Paper text:
Only three out of the seven different β subunits, namely β1, β2 and β5, bear N-terminal proteolytic active centres, and before CP maturation these are protected by propeptides. In the last stage of CP biogenesis, the prosegments are autocatalytically removed through nucleophilic attack by the active site residue Thr1 on the preceding peptide bond involving Gly(-1)45.
Instead, Lys33NH2, which is in hydrogen-bonding distance to Thr1Oγ (2.7 Å) in all catalytically active β subunits, was proposed to serve as the proton acceptor. Lys33NH2 is expected to act as the proton acceptor during autocatalytic removal of the propeptides, as well as during substrate proteolysis, while Asp17Oδ orients Lys33NH2 and makes it more prone to protonation by raising its pKa (hydrogen bond distance: Lys33NH3+–Asp17Oδ: 2.9 Å).
Author numbering:
A (entry chain M): 1 to 229
B (entry chain N): 1 to 196
C (entry chain H): 1 to 226
D (entry chain E): 3 to 233
E (entry chain G): 2 to 242
F (entry chain A): 1 to 250
G (entry chain I): 1 to 204
H (entry chain J): 1 to 195
The structure:
Amino acid sequence: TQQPIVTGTSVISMKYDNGVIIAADNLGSYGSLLRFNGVERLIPVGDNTVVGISGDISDMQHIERLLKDLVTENAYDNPLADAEEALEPSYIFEYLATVMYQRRSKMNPLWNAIIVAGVQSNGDQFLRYVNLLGVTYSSPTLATGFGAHMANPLLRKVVDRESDIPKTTVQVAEEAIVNAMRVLYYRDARSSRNFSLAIIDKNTGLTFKKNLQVENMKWDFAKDIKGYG
Amino acid sequence: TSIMAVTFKDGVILGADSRTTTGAYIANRVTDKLTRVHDKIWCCRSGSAADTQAIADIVQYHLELYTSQYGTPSTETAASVFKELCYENKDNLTAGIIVAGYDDKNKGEVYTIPLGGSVHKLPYAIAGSGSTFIYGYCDKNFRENMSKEETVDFIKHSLSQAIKWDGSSGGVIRMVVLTAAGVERLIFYPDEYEQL
Amino acid sequence: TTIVGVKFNNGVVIAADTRSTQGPIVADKNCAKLHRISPKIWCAGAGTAADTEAVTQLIGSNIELHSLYTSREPRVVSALQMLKQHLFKYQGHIGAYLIVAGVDPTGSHLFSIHAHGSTDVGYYLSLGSGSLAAMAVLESHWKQDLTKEEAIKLASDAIQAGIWNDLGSGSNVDVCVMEIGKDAEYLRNYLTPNVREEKQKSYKFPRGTTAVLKESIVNICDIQEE
Amino acid sequence: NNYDGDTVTFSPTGRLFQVEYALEAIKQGSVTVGLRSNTHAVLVALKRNADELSSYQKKIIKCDEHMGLSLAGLAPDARVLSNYLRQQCNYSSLVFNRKLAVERAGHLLCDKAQKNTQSYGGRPYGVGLLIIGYDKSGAHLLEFQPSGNVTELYGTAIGARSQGAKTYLERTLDTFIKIDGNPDELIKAGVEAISQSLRDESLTVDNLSIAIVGKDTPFTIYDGEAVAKYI
Amino acid sequence: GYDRHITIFSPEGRLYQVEYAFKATNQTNINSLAVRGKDCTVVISQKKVPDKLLDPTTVSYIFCISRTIGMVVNGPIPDARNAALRAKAEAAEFRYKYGYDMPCDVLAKRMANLSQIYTQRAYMRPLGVILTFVSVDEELGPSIYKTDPAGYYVGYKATATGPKQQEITTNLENHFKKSKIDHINEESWEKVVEFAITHMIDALGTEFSKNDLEVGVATKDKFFTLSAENIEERLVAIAEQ
Amino acid sequence: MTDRYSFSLTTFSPSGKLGQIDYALTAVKQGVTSLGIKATNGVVIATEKKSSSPLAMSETLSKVSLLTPDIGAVYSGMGPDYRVLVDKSRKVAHTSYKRIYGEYPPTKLLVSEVAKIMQEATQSGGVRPFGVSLLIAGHDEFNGFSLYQVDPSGSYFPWKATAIGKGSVAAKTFLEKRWNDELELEDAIHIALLTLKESVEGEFNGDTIELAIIGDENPDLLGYTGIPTDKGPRFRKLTSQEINDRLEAL
Amino acid sequence: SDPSSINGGIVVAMTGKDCVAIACDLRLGSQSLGVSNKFEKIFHYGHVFLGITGLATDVTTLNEMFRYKTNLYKLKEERAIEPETFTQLVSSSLYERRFGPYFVGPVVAGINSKSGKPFIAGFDLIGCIDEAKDFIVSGTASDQLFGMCESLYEPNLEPEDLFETISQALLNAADRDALSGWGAVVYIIKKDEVVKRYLKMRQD
Amino acid sequence: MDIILGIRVQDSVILASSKAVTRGISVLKDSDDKTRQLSPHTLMSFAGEAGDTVQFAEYIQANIQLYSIREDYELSPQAVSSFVRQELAKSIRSRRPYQVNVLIGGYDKKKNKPELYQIDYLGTKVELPYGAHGYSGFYTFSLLDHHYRPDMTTEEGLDLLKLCVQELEKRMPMDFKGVIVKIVDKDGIRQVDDF
Amino acid sequence: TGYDLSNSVFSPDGRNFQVEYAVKAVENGTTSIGIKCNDGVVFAVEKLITSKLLVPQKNVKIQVVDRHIGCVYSGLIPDGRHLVNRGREEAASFKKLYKTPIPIPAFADRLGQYVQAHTLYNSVRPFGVSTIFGGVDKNGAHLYMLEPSGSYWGYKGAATGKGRQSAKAELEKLVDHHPEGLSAREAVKQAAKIIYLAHEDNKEKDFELEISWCSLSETNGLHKFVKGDLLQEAIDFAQKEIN
Ligand SMILES: [Cl-]
Ligand SMILES: [Mg+2]
Ligand SMILES: [Mg+2]
Ligand SMILES: [Mg+2]
Ligand SMILES: [Mg+2]
């Protein structure tokens, strides 16, 4: 049993016709102090998987080292390490889910909420969640923390059920994700303007975008607001 | 406690106050909080004095044994050893450590390890109870690639303000300069920094 | 308890009061708080009295074995390192707060150590319930380059401040002087400013005052021959 | 001679006699054949009875839905090693949601056998194994020796008189590797291969044991009247 | 005759496995020498690189145990590196526990005690090495302490080890009989190294190039090894007088 | 790995002999001579510093060792075995006595502890016996001055005077003629030097002889003043000069 | 609830001219309930006397433990243990249970058989030694005993005068404590004679 | 368990123990025998926590019976009581202590004397002319302090015991359903079947 | 005699005969080599084709440790795998505590101490392999060779197995004719030639060539297997030189 010290906020994600998108901001909070401003919370594994992590940053850095070791280990005595026997998103998730549930069962959890986003060998989209309790679930859209309450409602308007996925392009999906990040910046006190975004597509592969900013913000209407009654 | 480390053109400088308190009593007014774990790898300690002394002694041992086998360790390696002790024993430790060092290949580097045992590489770092009062000042006044004299002034002015507002900080301002030229100790007394 | 340590020209001096208490009651009026770790390394203890004695004797024992193993006279930094690592491991549950002082081939040394395992360096230190009274005197009269005579005077004055002003401290002043290139001189009851005045009355009873039911000889001797 | 008392002793020419004696136990065992195409992999095994009242000792063990082996030598040692393979296949599925690659299974068996050849008190395993499987890189066949040596092959045979079947497969190499999408013809080739190792006895209905795994075929073992079609 | 295979007493009260470990000590066919100056301690050792395919920079029998302590080994390299790793670990642990640098004589005693255990416990074999530890001790000054497979150790004014140790030993003995002092009366370590090389040349009757020698020097607060070019400068000075 | 020698390496032979112990005693017989003499007001122990090389500094090799402030030890046999036994003896004096009773053990009981360690190396699994015989001299309040011999088997005996190692048979005869119950410490030292000269071939002086006494308390060697009851160690190693002074009155 | 005051009782020791005295009450109780008036708290191992107050199960256990240890001491040392040495043994034995201690207040009294010097000592439950020249007190009426001893005691009292002093110290202290009394014993100890006297006192 | 009383007279020891077993709301039994014979001339009664009482008593019984067989000899009451005290003194610093209080009544055949020992769950032992555990002594000791004589007969002891039980039945709030009474003397152990 | 019946026993010579017998198993194995080039290392091994039934390119012999170290060995193949497994554990623990990937000299001693430990007791058998290994670290390229005794040194070129004498002679020519150094691509070509030339000691059966390399410029300091066109080019160069 512990308490989280340095923490990261929401991770948000969704499926579209040819793949998946995932995003998270670059802040490391120390309670209400916005202490660290250059923290990368999306960690790519190969060219087919991106793992997005919220919660305790010390535990995130540990998980990052576990994934790095997983890639090293998979390559051992494996001639097809960059082909048929490469790490799949499904393999990476199941491993993390096993670790998370084992750690909660020893009453010593990794204080995180994790979303694994990727594309499988057969082109199928992969998107699944796991947290400090070992709880897992899948959905056309997934989000952690504040994102669950504010991003999901917006992302579900684009893809409401499974049959909406083939009708959703990458342009429409990215647009929806970027808007959700703006909404979170307006309303989450532990969020930042700077964020990272990753697209995993079955045709164009992994596109990793750093140093993105929330833009097109509405503040002008504040000038007319006076007093409290 | 008020501690900081700042990278500059020729390397890195560590800074600290000298006050150690038991409640409101000053148990030591001339404490040395800048501790050597290797020739040109030092650290600033905050939190439990017992914990940070224990950790620093273990790190000094680890780096002494590393040096005998593999030669001079990098600052990153020293930070990693600090992290391993802080992360794995997070339930039983209260330690906030800043690691600073000079390589010839990497030059001046600063790593901060907060309570949870995470690591963060930064151009400069501030920690301790007094640091809260100088987040604004340090963010506005820090520049990359400053001179030795400019960096001494930046730290002197920063810790002066931390001491002024934080009751748990005070005494003399100690500094350790890490460059290719060697290791230099500096000390600044109240009559100097209080009039800044 | 009041304990102090003071560095001087060619060595270091340590001093203590002689009162030990259980709550508000004085258990012993002439307690010995200056303990020997080794011939020229001495320490004074505050806190849990059994812990201060036990940790002193354990490290003192191991220091003696270390000295014999290495064919070298014991060092103060060794006593310090062994004390702090023992205390840290027990996470403050061994309630020993010590001032450690001594001379060795490296020179003269003065350290403090707290129950959780933290240590500190200084030219003048004080510990115990009378430490604030003692430190007030030390902060008023300490200077660089004190002589032996000046340091003994300063140390005993600091203990006196504890004796008169702290209820936890009292009775006599004990002093130990450790000078470089000399035998450490332990000065038991260096000052005696608290002798009890003669009582108004003798309370010796007439013989036969106490009522007795039975008398018998107690056999303390072993089983006898023949 | 003076160097065969335990597995912890090299001979003056650098040989390990206890390991060589363990290898000898395989040669006394009954013949078993392995071969594969690009779609399927087949095991054929001649089972041995004690007498006419007794059953015929089983030779083929299933390790997972996609993997299994045949044995020759000490049967209890095959049970220990196949149990270990079952556990490792299982660990891979439970922890990584991943079917264990046949090549990695061979590496694990090698390392387990090696530890018994370098330490005092223990003994080498006294059994040889032919592992077939279908994974993400297609059909596979492996040969295991208790020396620790594991080898990937198109076809092979181990046990008594296995040299006859091995030569036949070496001739037929170009034909049986091309038998894709036809399980019956691949088994026919395996039954014809194991026939080159028979003397005095022939393949009967309780004598023959066949196993197959492939593209859309879970590892299944055929015994009894299920192999009469191939007799 | 299993009293010859393990470390138990023979009928003569001898330990044959220990005696045979002393013989393994000369398997490398290398000679080493150590001497003391006023402010320093010097150790030199022969360097032989018999294969052209070898990287000569990796061929070494001198070890930097701690900042202050150096160690030269006579014996096979596997056992040498075994002893080197253990000595490094012991020196580091000592500093951590007792708060000061492990003295040269104390490390020698510790490694000698470990060796004694291998002569008494059957499951462990002796290491086929002789270890010469050097430093400038903060209490005792320039120091040479040498350990062997029997678990014996002692301090030396100077010492020699290897197949031709006797020739070097007698040469050193004769010099100290003349001077009547326990050290080389010289200010600089450079000249103490020159003395050491000169007297090894005299004793062995062989000339040395820069690649034929290996040199370690202990001064106050550091032990270091010389490069081939540093040794060359030493050889030039010897030849010029 | 693991120590797989869990069985005894010393066993009874058909004749009832414990071979390894006998062979250990043979190793002691080859060792350099050491002796001990008890006087009315002290005990003396002595041996030869047989230097292996003249380049070796024989002062760095201590054959006579302080075990406690009032107890000293010398040996004959295998030097390394002696060194580790001195380490174990010094520690056991603390762990099994001083940390319990707050005082150093009496001579006879420390001897008993050393003897136990040597006995166990004669029965425990996978070890050989120690190849040394020890002579332990000491003083304690209630037993006075005493001298003990400890052998590889773990057996120990008290002596008025004795010798072990190389020339022990001749030395013991020499001691029988000279010893009486009225000897003063200086007389015992004189007899020790006379006895030791017979077994020494080469140089015989303060630099080649190691000699120590258990005698009066030495307050000058205590290292501190102020505690009346603490009066200093009774063990004292004689200097090279002190030995040479008594070699002129020889 | 407090283990050191469940059973009740007191011990006091004093020094005189060439003599020592040690005394105790006889009560054992279960809080308010008086259970026994014959529970003696002073034991002896040779010529060394040990009084123990506190939790009665630990009093009995420690007596058995020190009888055990002093018997082995005598067999090995071939002599009776002295007061100074036994004091260190009590201290060592108590500290070895530092974090699960015996809830007791031991008191040692005796004369060194070689020097003839009178000796007394006291301990807290975990082993800290109090070696007073004058007197040592222990138990549920230790405050009362401190008051009595401080006023009644004078140095160099003859054996028969010391008896009166220590008796009056115990009796009057016990009569101001609910959990002490129900009888009392006084030991007068000289170099080679020890007298034991049971005192008459109120039984409430 | 509740009331356990003991009295040592001239030539015997008498133990009286209540018959009720109550589990919270209901009295489950009214004929429970809270005693175990440890040896032919030694009886132990017990009271404390449910389960632990019988477990401890049977454990002690097994151990004394083992000693009796091994040595072909009956331990003295003093020796048995010391063994029991040590077991409880050991138990009080265990992970989960035995919460059991006992009385040991024995006739010493060597000394020809009855003996009564009272031991609580801490390992507090006393030898007494009469004893009890719990609240039993609070009601009965004033009667025993008045009437008890060391030269009493067994019949006089039983009569004094009846007076004690009558006072308990009057002033105690709990119904303990009477007592089973057992006598320990030179001839062994017997139960008084009408009380 | 009897000194050779038990590991860790010194003979009257001061020799460990069991270790010398392990060397015989190494000398019985196939030929493996290592070449240190300008900014890296190349490893190559001879794989004997015992039968047509062996699947080409499948039974891989060279092994990677971490991502920057290559290992090849001759002798008992299982023993080599056991040593590489330990090496992988040593590399993982080093990187765990110190962050940086294990330096090659550091890694060399880890293998060395482990192999040496198997010469200390009679309850274990010495390793029946000689291992050639190396890679690129912060101080550049390093090539090592480790023997059953635990003995290891750094090398410019290394060879072991049945055709080691032939290979060594070829390596010595390259050292003499190129004091300035050899390129990584040249070293691959030369490695192919040397294995083909060393195959004369194993001429009865035909073989399969297997090459790997770590180079700062060619592989970014990572260990990779030589495949496809680059492998065929090296095979052609080798076949041209033997004719
Ligand atoms: Cl040791
Ligand atoms: Mg302030
Ligand atoms: Mg051995
Ligand atoms: Mg009362
Ligand atoms: Mg009353």
